[PDB]
């Protein structure tokens, strides 16, 4: 089927966007069992799939939002008494996107996980006003270290999962009812399931490593099977489910998803001759000579 697959394009899966790798590259990424894949997709179901307000709310809850994306203007004000960076939050855009963010939440997000600024340096001067006061930390950072914060402060997260990069509201238009789901282009399934309003029981993912680490090895096997079947069906060619089931089991019979690459092949197999013939001939041969591993003819 790899030769039969044409490696087509324009197959956005009905969203007309979010280019996903499908075809021989996708089968390669699946069989390699790489920890980080290209264009990871996470499908999450909603408890209230008929309401769009709740869908956008859970989106804003899961989607990463930077401070610069919600603030209307950031200005460095050098008052005659002291200098500090000021940030004005656009409450209008906040209520438009339905993000549960305020000045105090922004202050708490600052000083945490980035830029090391202490809580005593950040203050709130109004309903949608935040202030940051750098200091002479003496770590090659004089007061003009402003020029660092002014470049880093706009990229500080205020809400959402840091790993999540983009989340969209997909809609299924079934004749019975039009339902809403979340398509997240991130690499964090645990955080998506742990978020409020997301039906963690019917949440899947494309990255096999995340499924393995989160929901066990059987979940990883099922995800591999479903993903291979879907990737093969996208090209109009069908394969008996038994082949993909055997492949997934062989990849998930030692309790860990081991890829088909030389590393997983060596971790699974034990014959020295086969490993030496596949790849790394001299290295494997010298390692076996050192270990004195006797190889059978099974």
């Amino acid at each position: 089927p790899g030769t039969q697959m044409t490696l087509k394009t324009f197959h956005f899966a009905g969203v007309a966007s979010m280019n996903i790798t499908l075809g021989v590259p996708r089968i390669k990424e699946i069989i390699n069992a790489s920890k980080a894949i290209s264009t990871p997709i996470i499908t999450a179901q909603l408890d209230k799939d008929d309401d769009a307000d709740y869908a956008r709310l859970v989106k804003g809850r899961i989607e990463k939002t930077l401070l610069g994306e919600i603030s209307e203007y950031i200005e460095e004000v050098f008052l005659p008494d002291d200098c500090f960076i000021l940030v004005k939050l656009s409450l209008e855009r906040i209520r438009l996107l339905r993000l549960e963010v305020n000045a105090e939440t922004v202050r708490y997000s600052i000083c945490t996980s980035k830029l090391r600024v202490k809580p005593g340096d950040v203050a709130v001067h109004g309903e949608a006003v935040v202030c940051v006061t750098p200091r002479e930390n003496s770590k090659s950072s004089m007061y003009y270290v402003l020029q660092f914060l002014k470049e880093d402060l706009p990229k500080v997260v205020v809400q959402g999962i840091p790993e999540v990069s983009r989340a969209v509201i997909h809609i299924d238009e079934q004749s019975g009812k039009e339902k809403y789901k979340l398509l997240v282009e991130g690499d964090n399934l645990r955080a998506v399931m742990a978020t409020h309003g997301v039906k963690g029981t019917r949440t899947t993912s494309n990255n096999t490593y995340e499924v393995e680490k989160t929901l066990g090895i059987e979940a990883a096997r099922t995800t591999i099977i479903n993903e291979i079947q879907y990737t093969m069906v996208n090209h109009g060619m069908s394969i008996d489910r038994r082949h993909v089931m055997l492949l997934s089991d062989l990849m998930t019979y030692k309790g860990e998803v081991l890829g088909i690459t030389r590393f997983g092949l060596a971790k699974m197999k034990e014959s020295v001759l086969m490993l030496a013939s596949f790849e790394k001939t001299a290295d494997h041969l010298f390692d076996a000579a050192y270990f004195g591993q006797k190889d059978s003819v099974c």
Partner: protein, 54 residues
Amino acid sequence: MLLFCPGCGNGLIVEEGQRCHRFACNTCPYVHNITRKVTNRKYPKLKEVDDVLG
């Protein structure tokens, strides 16, 4: 923001003097005290509402 000394043309840092904050150059004694408020807005593009594709 970026400002330069009329004397030599190097960048002006902001430092706390003996009376008031001032712009100063690291290669000459030129200084300039701040009298009124000075602001430099950037107007970041915000996030937009994205839609319900599907």
